[PDB]
Design a protein around this ligand. Structure first.
Ligand SMILES: *[C@@H]1O[C@H](CO)[C@@H](O[C@@H]2O[C@H](CO)[C@@H](O[C@@H]3O[C@H](CO[C@H]4O[C@H](CO)[C@@H](O)[C@H](O)[C@@H]4O)[C@@H](O)[C@H](O)[C@@H]3O)[C@H](O)[C@H]2NC(C)=O)[C@H](O)[C@H]1NC(C)=O
Lengths: 194, 225
């Protein structure tokens, strides 16, 4: 069986970055040249692996994490980065092994008047650990008065919609991102090349 | 809620200063806290930010010279300023940022420091002279596209900190009268005052916070004809 990368890359809808999706790939064969040859990917940056060598090894696990962010935020999906997305939404480890793949999705994910379906976390007390996911919607206390789950001054809903509009500049346009993590442990190695 | 700055002075070039900003009502460690500066007779310049989670960012012109920090137990923000230059002369403001949820809404009173790429926002006219009761239109044009969610207008009276008028291009801040309105048409971002009151004569600044660094227009002086 072919690895179901089409289900990931060609999915009709993507996850919000704060609620980023993870798909485990296993028990299948992949041709990674189908991905890295593509003129569609404006980002294709690998760490610890060369994409032209991914076909050379059977892995024990491949994970595909996917979500939508702004074009100006794709740079945050890299080891060692900081900012709202790296700190509070999706965090790669300092010594990540895998590839970060992104493409402009303005034609799919922007809407007249703003797409409110894609959200990010604006407020969080502390930074995420690598590969941590926070989907909570507790009202965020920015002042000394407790919020008791009620929004108001100094008491904020922690998530925010991107509101993608098709006429935005490219830095404000939505980008679909897929992060491929590659692992080889002392376990069955079932994710193979051609 | 209040922010109280201190630590400024008149210092020789090459010296150091440490600014302090004591907060009440808001918690420094829970907020995007910023330093913004204003040189004598000039506009506003973003200097530094400290995230609740600890990340820090700086304007290129102060990198390697200034350091932002906080003391949670003292609910205080600091700006350590080393290797001071004549160009660092400004009033320095401590400011809380709500970003798309409310922009720079809380400002301190400022502390004076005297020593002796980015989206450009162009405001027009430089000076706007009109009579009370008239409609005023003020323009702000960006050097590249800025989504409407990331635009704000401020009013500054003499000797005071700027006051947020409008954020997200068209959302009035709390307590701002409805004669103030904001709109975007093309690359032009406009502030309209439908009927000028005597208290409306002030300096007006636009701001974008969608691309780093945060930048401000050079200001429009609204004066009586
Ligand atoms: C998601 O759906 C997409 C739409 O069908 C899939 O894209 C197609 O993928 C196939 C398999 O790789 C391509 O067919 C091959 O094309 C190459 C030549 O590639 C050159 O041209 C493409 C544009 O067509 C360009 O992106 C490259 O840089 C190359 O210069 C041949 O050598 C093969 O024999 C085979 O015909 C399709 O060309 C491609 N379509 C498009 C419109 O890009 C995509 O694979 C799907 N994703 C997943 C993960 O399954």
């Amino acid at each position: 069986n072919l690895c179901p990368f089409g289900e990931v890359f060609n999915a009709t809808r993507f996850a919000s970055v704060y609620a980023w999706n993870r798909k485990r790939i296993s028990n299948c064969v992949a041709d990674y040249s189908v991905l890295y040859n593509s003129a569609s990917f404006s980002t294709f940056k690998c760490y610890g692996v060369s994409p032209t060598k991914l076909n050379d090894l059977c892995f024990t696990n491949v994970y595909a994490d996917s979500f939508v962010i702004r074009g100006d935020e794709v740079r945050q999906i890299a080891p060692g980065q900081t900012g709202k997305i790296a700190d509070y939404n999706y965090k790669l480890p300092d010594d990540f092994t895998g590839c970060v793949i992104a493409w402009n999705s303005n034609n799919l994910d922007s809407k007249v008047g703003g797409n409110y379906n894609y959200l990010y976390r604006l407020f969080r007390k502390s930074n995420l650990k690598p590969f941590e996911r926070d989907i909570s919607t507790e009202i965020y206390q920015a002042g000394s008065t407790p919020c008791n789950g009620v929004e108001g001054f100094n008491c904020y809903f922690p998530l925010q919609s991107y509101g993608f509009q098709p006429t935005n500049g490219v830095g404000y346009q939505p980008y679909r991102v897929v992060v491929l993590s590659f692992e080889l442990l002392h376990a069955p190695a079932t994710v193979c090349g051609p | 809620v209040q922010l109280v700055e201190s630590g400024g002075g008149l210092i020789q070039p090459g010296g150091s200063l440490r600014l302090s900003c004591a907060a009440s009502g808001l918690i420094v460690s829970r907020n995007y806290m910023n330093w913004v500066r204003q040189a004598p007779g000039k506009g506003l310049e973003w200097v530094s930010v400290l995230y609740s989670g600890g990340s820090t960012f700086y304007a290129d012109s102060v990198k390697g010279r200034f350091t932002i920090s906080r003391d949670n137990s003292k609910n205080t923000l600091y700006l350590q300023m080393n290797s001071l230059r004549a160009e660092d002369t400004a009033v320095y403001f401590c400011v809380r940022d709500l970003d798309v949820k409310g922009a720079f809404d809380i400002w301190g009173q400022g502390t004076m420091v005297s020593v002796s790429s980015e989206i450009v926002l162009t405001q027009s006219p430089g000076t706007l002279s009109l009579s009370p009761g008239e409609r005023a239109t003020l323009s702000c044009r960006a050097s590249q596209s800025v989504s409407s969610s990331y635009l704000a207008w401020y009013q500054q009276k003499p000797g005071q900190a700027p006051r947020l008028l409008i954020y997200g291009a068209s959302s009035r801040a709390t307590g701002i009268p409805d004669r103030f309105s904001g709109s975007v048409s093309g690359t032009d971002f406009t502030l309209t005052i439908s009927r000028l009151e005597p208290e409306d004569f002030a300096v007006y600044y636009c701001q974008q916070y969608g691309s780093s660094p945060i930048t401000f227009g050079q200001g429009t002086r609204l004066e009586i004809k």
